[PDB]
Design an enzyme around this catalytic site. Sequence first.
Site, PDB file in Angstrom:
ATOM      1  N   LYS A   1       0.826  -1.202   0.000  1.00 16.05           N
ATOM      2  CA  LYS A   1       0.000   0.000   0.000  1.00 16.05           C
ATOM      3  C   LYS A   1       0.862   1.253   0.000  1.00 16.05           C
TER       4      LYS A   1
ATOM      5  N   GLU B   1       0.919   5.318  10.137  1.00 14.74           N
ATOM      6  CA  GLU B   1       1.728   4.508   9.243  1.00 14.74           C
ATOM      7  C   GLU B   1       3.137   4.360   9.816  1.00 14.74           C
ATOM      8  N   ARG B   2       4.034   3.814   9.003  1.00 16.88           N
ATOM      9  CA  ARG B   2       5.407   3.604   9.436  1.00 16.88           C
ATOM     10  C   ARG B   2       6.209   4.889   9.283  1.00 16.88           C
TER      11      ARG B   2
END
Lengths: 464, 114, 464, 47, 508, 49, 99, 50
Positions: free
Chosen positions: C159, C185-186
């Site tokens: 994604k 998110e990361r």
Amino acid sequence: TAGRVVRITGPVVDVEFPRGSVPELFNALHAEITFGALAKTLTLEVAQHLGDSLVRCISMQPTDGLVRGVEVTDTGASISVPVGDGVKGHVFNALGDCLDDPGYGKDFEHWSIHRKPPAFSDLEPRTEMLETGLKVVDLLTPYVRGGKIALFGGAGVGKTVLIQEMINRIARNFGGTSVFAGVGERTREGNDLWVELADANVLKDTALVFGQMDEPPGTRMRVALSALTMAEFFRDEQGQDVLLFIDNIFRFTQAGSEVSTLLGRMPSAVGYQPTLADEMGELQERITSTRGRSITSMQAVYVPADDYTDPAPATTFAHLDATTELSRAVFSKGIFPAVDPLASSSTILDPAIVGDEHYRVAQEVIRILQRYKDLQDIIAILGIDELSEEDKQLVNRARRIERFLSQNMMAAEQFTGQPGSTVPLKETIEAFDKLTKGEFDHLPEQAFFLIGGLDDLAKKAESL
Amino acid sequence: PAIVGDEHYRVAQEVIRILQRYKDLQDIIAILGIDELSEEDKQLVNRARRIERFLSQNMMAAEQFTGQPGSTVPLKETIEAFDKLTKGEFDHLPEQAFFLIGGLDDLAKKAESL
Amino acid sequence: TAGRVVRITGPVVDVEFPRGSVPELFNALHAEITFGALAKTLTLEVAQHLGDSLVRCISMQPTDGLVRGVEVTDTGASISVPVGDGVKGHVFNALGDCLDDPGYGKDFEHWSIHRKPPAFSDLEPRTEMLETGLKVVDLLTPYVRGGKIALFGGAGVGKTVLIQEMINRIARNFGGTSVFAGVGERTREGNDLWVELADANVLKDTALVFGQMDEPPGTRMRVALSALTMAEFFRDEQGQDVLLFIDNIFRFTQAGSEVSTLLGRMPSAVGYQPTLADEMGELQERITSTRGRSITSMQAVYVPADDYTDPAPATTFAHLDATTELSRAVFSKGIFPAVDPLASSSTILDPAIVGDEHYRVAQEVIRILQRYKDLQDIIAILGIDELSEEDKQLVNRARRIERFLSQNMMAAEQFTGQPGSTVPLKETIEAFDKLTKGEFDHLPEQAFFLIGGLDDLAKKAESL
Amino acid sequence: ASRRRAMKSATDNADDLIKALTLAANRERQAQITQEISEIVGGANAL
Amino acid sequence: ADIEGAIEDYVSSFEREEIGTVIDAGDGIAHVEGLPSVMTQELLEFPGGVLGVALNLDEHSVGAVILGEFEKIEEGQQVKRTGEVLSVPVGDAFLGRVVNPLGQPIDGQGDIAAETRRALELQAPSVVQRQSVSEPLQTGIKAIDAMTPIGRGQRQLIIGDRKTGKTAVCVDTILNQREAWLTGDPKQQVRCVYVAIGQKGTTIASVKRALEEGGAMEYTTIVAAPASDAAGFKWLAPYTGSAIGQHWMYNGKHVLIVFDDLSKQADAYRAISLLLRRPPGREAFPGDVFYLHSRLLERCAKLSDELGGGSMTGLPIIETKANDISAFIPTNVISITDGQCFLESDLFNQGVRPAINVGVSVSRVGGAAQIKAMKEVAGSLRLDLSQYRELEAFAAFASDLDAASKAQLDRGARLVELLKQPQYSPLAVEEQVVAIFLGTQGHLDSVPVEDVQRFESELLEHVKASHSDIFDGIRETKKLSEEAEEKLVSVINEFKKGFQASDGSSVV
Amino acid sequence: YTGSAIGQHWMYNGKHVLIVFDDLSKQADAYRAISLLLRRPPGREAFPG
Amino acid sequence: YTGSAIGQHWMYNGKHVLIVFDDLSKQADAYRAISLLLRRPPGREAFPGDVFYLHSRLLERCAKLSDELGGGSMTGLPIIETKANDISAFIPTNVISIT
Amino acid sequence: YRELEAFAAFASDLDAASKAQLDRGARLVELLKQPQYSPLAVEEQVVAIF
Ligand SMILES: Nc1ncnc2c1ncn2[C@@H]1O[C@H](COP(=O)(O)OP(=O)(O)OP(=O)(O)O)[C@@H](O)[C@H]1O
Ligand SMILES: [Mg+2]
């Protein structure tokens, strides 16, 4: 001395009573909704005692418009339904109120819908056949007097026509009556059934008890018990054999689950009420034969996800003594009553209960029809001419046997005018013995359609 | 291999490879049987069935059930027998010879019996 | 008049106020943590009023170090974020504090991150295609300019890679303003995005808002709103065409779940908060584009347990015009960028918008792929050699189409080594039309893997 | 003839497999419903 | 002794106005202390013009679901009770308007002149008050009208996974009523209500644009409850639409109510119930979710001639997940409804659009909902399609099949192509009759499969332009007369010569 | 967390660290146990939110 | 349990007893109902952890007493109603492990 | 005999030993078949299995 509403949460209503007047379990209390648009007399069924003189009740009618502090009056008895020959020919709801003639039956004898099943010593000790007169039912899936019959089917397979046929047969052959417990009955389907029975002129022989879907779960749960109380009155007081339809008894289980969830009880395995088996037993065990008079029941069972291991059908099928599956395929072939000879089954089709000749003939018929169904895949693709001579002979014989299972049902007398035929069990057994031996394979296939026995077979053969 | 030795480890891993490949072919065997398999896979399935059945043993505690006396196979004999099985040296014997036999001499005796 | 921390439970803090000064819902309160290692000003967002002058708040920073009875002051207004042309080219957190230049936006116009969506009277459906350059997206999941776009995906199916690629394809030449919202998110991917945008000189047109997964549930809830407030300022107060990338929007709902039980809410199915749909609907409806004011939004939606039936993805699906659905099954087959051509959809993939040629080609591709998916079961056991000649040809074409839908993306260069490629929409339509008619059945299937165009197809065919 | 026999056997085996898989799927469906309800009512009981 | 008497006197003591106070407020729910005379589902009003519905009535407080603008509710706010249970305005003024579940216009146009106000919880027509469903409600979809006919007064569920064509089917049904509306005959006109629950606002606008471009919006009312709205509106929207429809139904008009979707109705009700601490059941739904949907749907009916003969047709839409029709809400609404149109993504991708899975799809009203022409023409359609789905395994090996089986397979392929239909293009019942007549009577046997969809579309057009006598005869008589059938066959054969197949073959 | 703190001390002094967590699945189980014993109502799979 | 008590009185008197339970899955369902009505959290297949105990407690008392105790015995034929030959269900496996 | 009968349902032919086993197994099955409410004394069972 009257109660007072203190908590209203959807169908659940809590009522506080004076310390010395708390109603007992399953009593029917009355409350008034006075708002003009929603004016009503709520009938609440006491479900639990919460202490401090509070009782938790499941409202049998929508609680919308109900006001805290409103007086609640205790009737002193559980939900009581009218009973007697007066209930015949009329349609009631779960609470005993007449729908097609409001105010009717309010003066009849009133029986509590919470009745214990027959004492142990009163039950019959041997299963007895119910000679319904239908060739297919008598031969391949003999019903049980005082037993419960699954009725699978749907729209366009003649389930209503079969119901009319069974009502007619119980009313005329056995001199009995019928009660149609429309649990979770679609109001459209309820009206259609009412008008169909009125036109078929069988409404006079049956009492209809509709617990409509739009009603809260309490009435959908208690409508089966109300109809079964009418049936019990006919069995134990009028001395009449009764045939109690319970379409659909999955909806009884589902309403019980919904009520259990409303009351806050932790769900069982698949989300069903913990007392699922107890409720199904309380409903079904009252459907039994006593003192020579019996209540038979044909119960359409919905099998969720087609999972016969599901708790609802699994519990229901522990009580059912036979199964009748109406197939669209058989109906399309003109074979009314539309019973699927192979997918149907009975627990009496055993040499001990039925005659040994009966079992032998029925098993021969089942074998022939099974072989024919297996050959149908070959026939529909490669053509009838690809089969062998033995296969062709068996196919013709099976065609004639399956078409002979049709019958000129009494329910059809309203349309065609030909009187319905009641085929004795012995005549059916000998006829199908002959059919399986091939003694009638030289007649045209059209000769066996909708004929009640061997004499009509010969007459129709002569007419062709 | 640093504990049980190179030969024992190699034989054990070859047996596990054969049995895992047999497990992978399980659905195909269920539907169509060994007949549709490739010849390599057919041979592998034959000796996988023989290996699986040769892992069965007549336990000395089982004498109370089947009445058959129990056996004891020393580790060296087990390693040798399973090396031969994985190499196909016994893939001509019938599958029945390997049930509950426990050893190579007993395997030969039961092969003679059948 | 100031509050007092009464009860602390992870990210949820209860605060008692004098009876006359209970803060409104969604107001921002400031407590103070004085422990040296974790000293900070702790921003609480009032989430409930629970009586007796107690409010319940969701902390934005970690509550580690907070002490019962510490004074809590009321701001009198909800969490506010800076807005304007100034926030472009800068990185902010959920609270609006600048990261790359502390104290930057302290004097900009501040908007509350809570506002009602645009009135239904202002909504106008968007039907203009947004040419991406990706074959699969342009053919089967055509994106909408001004509409809402989604990248649905399980865990680690690409994604973030695909959304970074989408930034590379849409934002580089975009004349408007971009806003990227890192919602749980990361952080490494966020830093890579920041450096990539700085290198390409797209940063000056983009405002980044990060609420990465190291942050507690409150920031992961309100970072989406903080970024969407800048997007809404650009949409309304400036009329600029806006791009709004969000990764990952599910972390919003998930964050609400983490505090859902501590807030006192009974959990719904699969452990999600009962208000899942309402909260997500508010946030998603704020992202729409009013008439004459465009926000092209693209949201990465995490699919827990790779289950597209999970409540969060299922509820999100109703909020989107185009949904690129990434599946682990496709990713496992090497087909980067992981798109399931059958699950993905678009509301502008109609012949009246994308044209008859495009619609015919896309729908024939879908037909071939669905037939191949149905056949996979047969092929895996019975073998391809037992299929029909037409079905065998279709399977070959389907393999070639599946591999041709793969593309060497710019953001995936470090996964494949080879540089990125762009396929114009006309070229995609022509190439897939030819594939569907079988004009490339003579080339090996591996020639279609990660090529991006017909010229690359020919070159790789020569190389093989 | 051998193909007819083999395909009849294959159809029987596939029908048995379908019945077994349907039974397993029904067990898993019931288990999922029970587990979901257990989680929901555990969250409710703890308030 | 005196304790009980004094306690009872005090309780009885509890025309002055009643004002409560909010004590708790969170997640769309507000608890209101006081209001001793509040009635269940009464419409409370909170100071900032906000509205709520008294839904839980405990001895301590009244838990009220708040209908939007929730954040303006605070502890200590004064709450006033409106003495009216939930009611919505109703009248002819709602045609062409988009209203929120309270009857307030949100399309931005002027106010709506309400003829009357109807309570949301009035009883549905009882068993005695109804009449057998016998009038068709032509959806314009060949599949639905030929296989699972919808008779006005019916409840036909449209059930299937996302992006499968459910909203397309319902909007086509709404559009197909324009010919009836233009008649000006109240016995033919079908008024429409499209209830949107939880759909994004732009989707509702797209549906409105589809209805306007097709001209249906002049007899359709949209009760929009977008996802932006509180769970209260998403819960009330079907009841607001049903009340608007019921006002017309009891006045002799026919109504077509479309719920899009009831799954989001149930989700909103579950959220409200969980926030109200009501015990949860399967999938965390309250015990009365089945009761919610049944109470909603059983208003759909066909009133007896004593009650004006009006009808209301419900086309509820359900978004099953992973094609699991055994989920709780799908099971409930399948039990409630009279028939099911199962739309499947597998068929949709295969090119069967709209994706009605024949065989599993069923209508319990059945042929009673079809005009005699359609009843006779489509009688063989179902058997042919079933035979085709049985024979499909043999498509590869047609050379080894009996001539009858090969003919069945070839007929079935062309029937499947015949049942395909482009979006937003519903067919009048006469056009559907002629189309299905093409297939069932074998007039498509000579046409290539890949051209059937064209051969229909042109042929009908040709008829519509040149031999409208056939269409007029079918429409006026409702039956395909023998001379009309012969004329139609002659036109078919004349057209066959002029039709050029895409593959270049000759179709004669 | 103790391993992460020990590693972070070296990480912030310019040194490169490698952290193995064996297994984080057993940390999730322990956190579930702690949360249930503290009587936090659980989420899916009985785990805490 | 009452059947086992009636049998055990004979067993400890030196009499040989045979106990039939048609059917112990219906005892398990009843105990599940009681437990859920007492609000004991369910386990596998909505059964409480005590369900195994419920049957073991019952079927352990079917024993062949030593001659020290009269030499009596109580043979138990518990009946279990599997659903679709699913001998691997919770209660079937429990009773197999007890019997 | 159970697996042998399952195999024989589709095997074209089998050795005379296999056919003998099948014949014995069918007879053992038909022998263990017993009518309801007709328990056999242990010696009668011994003679029957003999
Ligand atoms: N008969 C048809 N022929 C071709 N395309 C169709 C047809 N019906 C619907 N579609 C297309 O299918 C897609 C889905 O349609 P639609 O939005 O009506 O479905 P839905 O299942 O109600 O969707 P959602 O769940 O998003 O509300 C749209 O592209 C629509 O154009
Ligand atoms: Mg839709």
